[PDB]
Amino acid sequence: KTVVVTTILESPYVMMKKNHEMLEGNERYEGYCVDLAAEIAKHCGFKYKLTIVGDGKYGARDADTKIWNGMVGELVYGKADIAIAPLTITLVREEVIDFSKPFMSLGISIMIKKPQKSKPLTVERMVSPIESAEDLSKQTEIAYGTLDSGSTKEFFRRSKIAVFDKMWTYMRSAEPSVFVRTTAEGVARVRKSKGKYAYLLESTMNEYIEQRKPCDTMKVGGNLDSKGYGIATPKGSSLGTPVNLAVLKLSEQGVLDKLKNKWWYDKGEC
Amino acid sequence: KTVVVTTILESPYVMMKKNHEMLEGNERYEGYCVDLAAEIAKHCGFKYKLTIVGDGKYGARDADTKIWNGMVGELVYGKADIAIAPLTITLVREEVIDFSKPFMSLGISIMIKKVSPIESAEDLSKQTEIAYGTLDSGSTKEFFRRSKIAVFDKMWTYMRSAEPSVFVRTTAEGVARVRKSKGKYAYLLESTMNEYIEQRKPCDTMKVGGNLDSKGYGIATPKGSSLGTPVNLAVLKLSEQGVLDKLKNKWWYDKGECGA
Amino acid sequence: KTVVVTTILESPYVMMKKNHEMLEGNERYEGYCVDLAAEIAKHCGFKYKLTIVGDGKYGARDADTKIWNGMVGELVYGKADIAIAPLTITLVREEVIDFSKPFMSLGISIMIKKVSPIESAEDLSKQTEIAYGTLDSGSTKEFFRRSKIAVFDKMWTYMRSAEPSVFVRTTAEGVARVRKSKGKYAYLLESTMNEYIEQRKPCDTMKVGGNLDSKGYGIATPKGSSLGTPVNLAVLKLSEQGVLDKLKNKWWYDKGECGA
Amino acid sequence: KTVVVTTILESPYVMMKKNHEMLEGNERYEGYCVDLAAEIAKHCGFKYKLTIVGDGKYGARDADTKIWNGMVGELVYGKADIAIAPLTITLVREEVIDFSKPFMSLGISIMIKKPQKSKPLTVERMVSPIESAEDLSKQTEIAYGTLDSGSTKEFFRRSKIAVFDKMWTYMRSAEPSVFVRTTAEGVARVRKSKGKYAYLLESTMNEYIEQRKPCDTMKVGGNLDSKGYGIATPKGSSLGTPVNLAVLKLSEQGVLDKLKNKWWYDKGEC
Ligand SMILES: NS(=O)(=O)c1cc2c(cc1Cl)N[C@H]([C@H]1C[C@H]3C=C[C@@H]1C3)NS2(=O)=O
Ligand SMILES: NS(=O)(=O)c1cc2c(cc1Cl)N[C@H]([C@H]1C[C@H]3C=C[C@@H]1C3)NS2(=O)=O
Ligand SMILES: NS(=O)(=O)c1cc2c(cc1Cl)N[C@H]([C@H]1C[C@H]3C=C[C@@H]1C3)NS2(=O)=O
Ligand SMILES: NS(=O)(=O)c1cc2c(cc1Cl)N[C@H]([C@H]1C[C@H]3C=C[C@@H]1C3)NS2(=O)=O
Ligand SMILES: N[C@@H](CCC(=O)O)C(=O)O
Ligand SMILES: N[C@@H](CCC(=O)O)C(=O)O
Ligand SMILES: N[C@@H](CCC(=O)O)C(=O)O
Ligand SMILES: N[C@@H](CCC(=O)O)C(=O)O
C-alpha cells in the first residue's frame, strides 16, 4: 500500500518540467523536494506518489470555522500521509501534526526592488531606502505585505515585539490589501510596484529569487528570526520515526548540503 | 518531585559563579543553559536541581564495549532525568535518547592563532605543516571518524594516525593549545564556542573558512520519557516568542570585550 | 600490391593543394598526413594510393544497427587497407581495429569568438546563456555520451536535448557557426585543429580553458593484419628521429599568419 | 596462478610507507603505480605481487654481450610477468617486448638548482644562467649528466640532431663521470653542486621534485621530445590485450587524470 505525498508548487522545491506534457507520474516534477522524497524512499523502503495540494496553501486554521486548509489540513484530516514540502515548523502546527528534525534552516527576510546605482572618485555605489525592519515600520511611503495563509502571517499576527506589533497593526488595517495569494504573486507585485512595495518571505526563496534573472530584486537586512522546514506526518502515524532517522542520516552524510548547493547556487546567474 | 538535570561546564552555557563558595543549590550556576533550564521549568511546571556531569564528557560509545558515557550515559542509565546542555543532535544519539527540536544553530569551525593561509578546510587538508585536532568523545570526532567524503577521510586518517596525540581532553585545553603553539596547531569545534572565544580576551584567535556543515543543540530526554512533549512544546514557544534569540544576544554579544 | 589508404579532408592534415585540377594520383594532396603516409611507406616499403572517405565522417557505430561508417567502417569492411588520418584512439574503435602507438597528443578544447566569460568547462556548463556543440559522428560526441562525470553528464544532457540541433556536420561548419554566432555559440573540438584555426586568418577565435582530457591520433590498421607491426615500428622510429616533431612544426607553426 | 609485477622504486610512482616495517605483502608499497596496478587488476581479475628489481634499473641492453638488465632484462628472460612501472616506450624496447598504450605523456627536461632572486621599481625578478638545451650545449662551465642505463641516455646516445649529438659527445667523454646511478642521486648532485650541475630527467619526475620541499630546484626550457609510459609485457604473451583494453578503459573513464592530480599536484609543499 503506497502513501500519499502532498507538496506545494514552489521553486526550487517543486517545479514543473518544460517537457512534462507527455510525462505521467512522479517524473513530471523536479526540484529540491522531489530529490528529498527520493532520498527518503532510498533510506526507508516505500513507494510514494507526488500530489500538489488543491488549494495551493501551506496551511492555516480559521479563527471561527476552526479547520485547517492547505497541506496541514490535508495531513490532519487524512487526505495525505506525509508532506515533503517547505513547511515551516510552528508552535500551532506541532500541536496537530508531527514534525521531524528540520532539513533546512531559514528566516524571515525582506524583498525590495533593487535600487538604481548612484553615479556620484568615479566610484559607483548603491543606496536603499530600507535598511532594517525597524526603519521599514517607521516609514509610511513604502507599503509591505506577506503571503496569505502561511507561517509568516501567523508569526506577525501573534508577535509581541513592539516593531512587529506595529507592522502587524499596519498590515491588518491596510487598504488596498497588501497580502498576496502566492509567492510568485508577491514577487510580481514587488517588480511591478516601482519600488513602492516590500515583500516579507522566507530567506531561502528570497536568495533564490535574487540569484536568478532578471536579477532586479534584493534582500535587505538580516533574518528577522530563525526557523526551519520539517517533514510532517499525522499525529501517531508510524512513518514519523523512519523519516526522522532518514533526515538525520541524510544530514550526517552531507547529502542535504550537496542538494542545497546544486539546487540553489549552482543554477545562479547575474 | 524535583527533576535532576545533567549539565556540563562549558562557557557561556554554564559557568561557575564567582560567589559560588557562599552559594548553594542552583543559585551558584549561571549562563545560557541555566536560563534555558529556568524557562523550561517555568513553562512545564516542574522543580529542577542542576547537577554537573561527573566526567567532563558529552557522550560516546566505546568500541567493543557498547557503554555510553558523559551526559548521554547519565540519561540512558537512569542517573539523569533531562540534559539541558549544548548536546549536539546526532544519529547515534537519536537511537538512544529523545532529542527536542533544535534551539541553537551551529557547525564545525576552524580556529587558528591571529592573510589566513589555511582559510579553507580543503586547503587545510592539503597542508601538513600546520596541525589540527578535535575534542574526544564529541559530535566532532565521531563526525570525522564516520565521514565518507574524501577530504574528511584524509582528515580523520591524519588525526587518528598522529604522534603526539592531537586530540584534546577539554575544549578549554584545545583553545589553550592553539594559543600556545605559535600558530602551529589548529582546533576544530562548534561555531558557537568559536564565536564566544574570539569575542573574549586575549582576542588572539580568529575563525577561518566556513562552517563545514550545520547541526543544532537539543534538549535531551531519556527514550519514552513523559517530559518529551512538554519540553519540545516549550522550546517551540520560546523560539516563537523570541526568548531564545534574546538569551543568545545577552550571553554572546552583550559584552564584546574586543574591538569589533 | 598497392595499399589503399583511407584519409579525410581535414586541415592541416590533408588539403586539396592549390592546383589539384591539373594533377593526378597522390600529387594532388598535401599536408601533415600526406607526409606521414609518405614516411610510413618509405619505411615499410609499400606503394600506396590515397583515397578520400566518401562520407566526411571519422567513424561511429549506429544504435539498433551496429554498422560502422566513416574510415572505421571503410576498415572493418575491407574497403581500405590503412587509415593514415587524425583518427582518435578510443575504446569502441580498439575493439574492431588495430591502432598503432599515438603519434600526436591532443585533447578536447573550447573555442569562442574573440577576459573571456566562459573560463573553464564547469563555468561553461553552469552558464546557460551561451550554447555549446560538437561535431557529430566523432570521438568527442562519443566521449560526452558515455561520460559518467557530473559536469560532462550535464553537458551531454544539454546537447542531446537541445533545439535547434547544436551539433555540426563538419568541423569547418562548427568553426563558421562560432564565427557567425556573434559570441553566442561555442565549439568543442580537438586541440590540434583548434590551434591551427586560431593561428590562421581571420584570427577572430580563441581557445579558452584547459583540455578536458588527453588522447592521441593513431595509424589505424584492420584487426589481424600484416601491416600493424611494420607501421607501429615505423611510427616509433619516426618519433625517435624527431620526424613527427619536424612535421608538426612545419604544418602548424611555420606559417603563423596572425599577430602573436 | 599469481603473476609477478615488477616495479622500480621511483617517486611518486612506487614509494615506501612510513610504517612498512610491520607490514607484509602488497601493503608495504604505495604511490601512483600501486594504484594503477590495483585498477588494472580490478578491470581484469588476476592476483599480483609487487617486486622491486634487484639492480634498480629501468632497462638497457649491454654492448658486446647483447643482454638486457633491469626491468626489461627480467621481463625478456621470463623471470617477471608484467612491469607496471614508469617504463618509457622506446623503439629498442618494443622489438623485444610487447608494450601497451601510454598511460602518461612525458618529455626530457632540464633541472638546475634554483637561482637566487635579483635585487633590482622595487620588483624582484629571477634570472637563470640556462634557458634551453642550445645554450646549455654552447657553454662549458655548467656540467650535465643523466641517469645511467635508462631511456634518456640511449636517446642522447643515438640522437642525430646536432645539438643533442654535441651534448652526447661531451657526456660520453667527461671526467669526472656526469651520469648517476639513481634519480635521487642526480637530484642530490644538483642540490650539492651549488648550481654548477644540471640534471636531465623526465618532466613528470622533474615537476614532482620541484613541488616538494625544500623546492630548491626548478625546470628550465621545455620538453626536448614527447614520449610516454606504458605497461610492459613479454613478447607474445596472453596479458597484452587485457591490459591494453584496461588502460584504455581507465583513460576513457577519467581515472588516470584523477590519479595524476592526486599524486602530483595535490601534495604541494611550496
Ligand atoms: N545549510 S542548510 O540551511 O541547507 C541545512 C540546515 C540544517 C541541516 C542541514 C543543512 Cl544542509 N540539518 C539540521 C538537522 C541535523 C541535526 C541537527 C539539527 C537537525 C537534526 N537541521 S538544520 O540546522 O535546519
Ligand atoms: N538565532 S539562534 O541560533 O539562537 C536560534 C536557532 C533556532 C531557533 C531559534 C533561535 Cl533564536 N529555532 C529552531 C526551531 C524552531 C522551530 C523551527 C525549527 C526549530 C523548530 N531551531 S534553530 O533554527 O536551531
Ligand atoms: N610534439 S607531438 O604532439 O607532434 C608528438 C607526440 C607524440 C610523439 C611524438 C611527437 Cl613529435 N610520440 C609518442 C609515442 C612514441 C613513443 C612513446 C609514446 C608513443 C610511443 N606519442 S605522442 O606522446 O602522442
Ligand atoms: N594528463 S596525463 O599526462 O596524466 C595522461 C596522458 C595520456 C592519457 C591519459 C592521461 Cl591522464 N591517455 C592516452 C591513451 C588514451 C588513448 C589515446 C592515447 C593513449 C590511448 N595516452 S596519454 O596521451 O600518454
Ligand atoms: N514557508 C512557509 C510559507 C511561506 C511564507 O510564509 O513566506 C510555510 O511553510 O508555512
Ligand atoms: N557539544 C558537543 C561537543 C563539542 C565538540 O564536538 O567538540 C557535543 O555534545 O557533542
Ligand atoms: N578526429 C576525431 C574527430 C574530431 C572530433 O571529435 O570532433 C576522430 O577521428 O574521432
Ligand atoms: N624514465 C626512463 C628512465 C629515466 C631516465 O632516463 O631519466 C625509463 O623508464 O626508461
mmCIF file with all atom_site columns, C-alpha atoms in Angstrom, chain B residues 166-238:
data_model
loop_
_atom_site.group_PDB
_atom_site.id
_atom_site.type_symbol
_atom_site.label_atom_id
_atom_site.label_alt_id
_atom_site.label_comp_id
_atom_site.label_asym_id
_atom_site.label_entity_id
_atom_site.label_seq_id
_atom_site.pdbx_PDB_ins_code
_atom_site.Cartn_x
_atom_site.Cartn_y
_atom_site.Cartn_z
_atom_site.occupancy
_atom_site.B_iso_or_equiv
_atom_site.pdbx_formal_charge
_atom_site.auth_seq_id
_atom_site.auth_comp_id
_atom_site.auth_asym_id
_atom_site.auth_atom_id
_atom_site.pdbx_PDB_model_num
ATOM 1  C CA . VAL B 1 166 ? 46.373 15.595 18.597 1.00 0.00 ? 166 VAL B CA 1
ATOM 2  C CA . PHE B 1 167 ? 43.000 15.319 20.344 1.00 0.00 ? 167 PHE B CA 1
ATOM 3  C CA . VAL B 1 168 ? 42.393 17.367 23.485 1.00 0.00 ? 168 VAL B CA 1
ATOM 4  C CA . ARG B 1 169 ? 40.644 16.394 26.698 1.00 0.00 ? 169 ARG B CA 1
ATOM 5  C CA . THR B 1 170 ? 38.557 19.576 27.046 1.00 0.00 ? 170 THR B CA 1
ATOM 6  C CA . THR B 1 171 ? 37.634 22.476 24.782 1.00 0.00 ? 171 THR B CA 1
ATOM 7  C CA . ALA B 1 172 ? 39.497 24.909 27.042 1.00 0.00 ? 172 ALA B CA 1
ATOM 8  C CA . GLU B 1 173 ? 42.583 22.723 26.677 1.00 0.00 ? 173 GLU B CA 1
ATOM 9  C CA . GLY B 1 174 ? 42.165 22.869 22.902 1.00 0.00 ? 174 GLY B CA 1
ATOM 10 C CA . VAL B 1 175 ? 41.934 26.659 22.841 1.00 0.00 ? 175 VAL B CA 1
ATOM 11 C CA . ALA B 1 176 ? 44.951 26.918 25.155 1.00 0.00 ? 176 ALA B CA 1
ATOM 12 C CA . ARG B 1 177 ? 46.914 24.563 22.901 1.00 0.00 ? 177 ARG B CA 1
ATOM 13 C CA . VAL B 1 178 ? 46.048 26.736 19.902 1.00 0.00 ? 178 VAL B CA 1
ATOM 14 C CA . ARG B 1 179 ? 47.087 29.875 21.792 1.00 0.00 ? 179 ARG B CA 1
ATOM 15 C CA . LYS B 1 180 ? 50.427 28.456 22.981 1.00 0.00 ? 180 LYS B CA 1
ATOM 16 C CA . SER B 1 181 ? 51.533 26.775 19.737 1.00 0.00 ? 181 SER B CA 1
ATOM 17 C CA . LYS B 1 182 ? 52.752 29.921 17.913 1.00 0.00 ? 182 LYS B CA 1
ATOM 18 C CA . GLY B 1 183 ? 50.295 29.278 15.104 1.00 0.00 ? 183 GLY B CA 1
ATOM 19 C CA . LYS B 1 184 ? 51.355 25.669 14.502 1.00 0.00 ? 184 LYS B CA 1
ATOM 20 C CA . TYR B 1 185 ? 48.216 23.975 15.890 1.00 0.00 ? 185 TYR B CA 1
ATOM 21 C CA . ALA B 1 186 ? 44.589 24.435 14.847 1.00 0.00 ? 186 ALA B CA 1
ATOM 22 C CA . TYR B 1 187 ? 41.444 23.466 16.751 1.00 0.00 ? 187 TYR B CA 1
ATOM 23 C CA . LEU B 1 188 ? 38.121 22.295 15.320 1.00 0.00 ? 188 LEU B CA 1
ATOM 24 C CA . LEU B 1 189 ? 34.998 22.878 17.407 1.00 0.00 ? 189 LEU B CA 1
ATOM 25 C CA . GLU B 1 190 ? 31.430 24.147 17.250 1.00 0.00 ? 190 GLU B CA 1
ATOM 26 C CA . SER B 1 191 ? 30.914 27.611 15.800 1.00 0.00 ? 191 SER B CA 1
ATOM 27 C CA . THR B 1 192 ? 29.148 28.934 18.908 1.00 0.00 ? 192 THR B CA 1
ATOM 28 C CA . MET B 1 193 ? 32.106 28.267 21.204 1.00 0.00 ? 193 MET B CA 1
ATOM 29 C CA . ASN B 1 194 ? 34.374 29.671 18.487 1.00 0.00 ? 194 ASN B CA 1
ATOM 30 C CA . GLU B 1 195 ? 32.486 32.975 18.350 1.00 0.00 ? 195 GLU B CA 1
ATOM 31 C CA . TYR B 1 196 ? 32.300 33.221 22.138 1.00 0.00 ? 196 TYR B CA 1
ATOM 32 C CA . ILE B 1 197 ? 36.041 32.600 22.463 1.00 0.00 ? 197 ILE B CA 1
ATOM 33 C CA . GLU B 1 198 ? 37.035 35.004 19.686 1.00 0.00 ? 198 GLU B CA 1
ATOM 34 C CA . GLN B 1 199 ? 34.894 37.767 21.207 1.00 0.00 ? 199 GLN B CA 1
ATOM 35 C CA . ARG B 1 200 ? 36.756 37.398 24.531 1.00 0.00 ? 200 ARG B CA 1
ATOM 36 C CA . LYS B 1 201 ? 40.248 38.089 25.836 1.00 0.00 ? 201 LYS B CA 1
ATOM 37 C CA . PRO B 1 202 ? 43.052 37.943 24.819 1.00 0.00 ? 202 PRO B CA 1
ATOM 38 C CA . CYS B 1 203 ? 41.370 38.123 21.383 1.00 0.00 ? 203 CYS B CA 1
ATOM 39 C CA . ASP B 1 204 ? 44.357 36.402 19.752 1.00 0.00 ? 204 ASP B CA 1
ATOM 40 C CA . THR B 1 205 ? 42.457 33.759 17.733 1.00 0.00 ? 205 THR B CA 1
ATOM 41 C CA . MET B 1 206 ? 40.031 34.038 14.827 1.00 0.00 ? 206 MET B CA 1
ATOM 42 C CA . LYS B 1 207 ? 37.660 31.791 12.882 1.00 0.00 ? 207 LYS B CA 1
ATOM 43 C CA . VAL B 1 208 ? 38.594 30.965 9.297  1.00 0.00 ? 208 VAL B CA 1
ATOM 44 C CA . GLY B 1 209 ? 36.872 29.399 6.317  1.00 0.00 ? 209 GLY B CA 1
ATOM 45 C CA . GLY B 1 210 ? 33.258 28.489 6.916  1.00 0.00 ? 210 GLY B CA 1
ATOM 46 C CA . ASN B 1 211 ? 31.094 26.032 8.786  1.00 0.00 ? 211 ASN B CA 1
ATOM 47 C CA . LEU B 1 212 ? 31.843 22.558 7.475  1.00 0.00 ? 212 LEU B CA 1
ATOM 48 C CA . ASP B 1 213 ? 28.204 21.544 7.983  1.00 0.00 ? 213 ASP B CA 1
ATOM 49 C CA . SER B 1 214 ? 25.161 22.535 10.045 1.00 0.00 ? 214 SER B CA 1
ATOM 50 C CA . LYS B 1 215 ? 23.930 20.929 13.268 1.00 0.00 ? 215 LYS B CA 1
ATOM 51 C CA . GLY B 1 216 ? 21.918 22.001 16.299 1.00 0.00 ? 216 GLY B CA 1
ATOM 52 C CA . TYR B 1 217 ? 21.800 21.610 20.045 1.00 0.00 ? 217 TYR B CA 1
ATOM 53 C CA . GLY B 1 218 ? 18.740 19.992 21.568 1.00 0.00 ? 218 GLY B CA 1
ATOM 54 C CA . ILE B 1 219 ? 17.202 19.347 24.952 1.00 0.00 ? 219 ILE B CA 1
ATOM 55 C CA . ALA B 1 220 ? 17.693 15.643 25.631 1.00 0.00 ? 220 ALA B CA 1
ATOM 56 C CA . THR B 1 221 ? 15.298 13.312 27.451 1.00 0.00 ? 221 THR B CA 1
ATOM 57 C CA . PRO B 1 222 ? 15.514 9.544  28.000 1.00 0.00 ? 222 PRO B CA 1
ATOM 58 C CA . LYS B 1 223 ? 13.703 7.428  25.440 1.00 0.00 ? 223 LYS B CA 1
ATOM 59 C CA . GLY B 1 224 ? 9.999  7.150  26.194 1.00 0.00 ? 224 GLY B CA 1
ATOM 60 C CA . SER B 1 225 ? 10.051 9.745  28.974 1.00 0.00 ? 225 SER B CA 1
ATOM 61 C CA . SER B 1 226 ? 6.996  11.803 29.898 1.00 0.00 ? 226 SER B CA 1
ATOM 62 C CA . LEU B 1 227 ? 8.794  15.171 29.600 1.00 0.00 ? 227 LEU B CA 1
ATOM 63 C CA . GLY B 1 228 ? 9.410  14.920 25.845 1.00 0.00 ? 228 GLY B CA 1
ATOM 64 C CA . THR B 1 229 ? 6.343  16.722 24.530 1.00 0.00 ? 229 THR B CA 1
ATOM 65 C CA . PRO B 1 230 ? 6.264  19.386 27.310 1.00 0.00 ? 230 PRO B CA 1
ATOM 66 C CA . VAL B 1 231 ? 9.890  20.418 26.759 1.00 0.00 ? 231 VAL B CA 1
ATOM 67 C CA . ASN B 1 232 ? 9.562  20.245 22.964 1.00 0.00 ? 232 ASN B CA 1
ATOM 68 C CA . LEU B 1 233 ? 6.496  22.498 23.015 1.00 0.00 ? 233 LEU B CA 1
ATOM 69 C CA . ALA B 1 234 ? 8.265  24.788 25.492 1.00 0.00 ? 234 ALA B CA 1
ATOM 70 C CA . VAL B 1 235 ? 11.255 25.104 23.150 1.00 0.00 ? 235 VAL B CA 1
ATOM 71 C CA . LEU B 1 236 ? 8.934  25.862 20.239 1.00 0.00 ? 236 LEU B CA 1
ATOM 72 C CA . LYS B 1 237 ? 7.099  28.546 22.229 1.00 0.00 ? 237 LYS B CA 1
ATOM 73 C CA . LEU B 1 238 ? 10.349 30.092 23.468 1.00 0.00 ? 238 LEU B CA 1
#
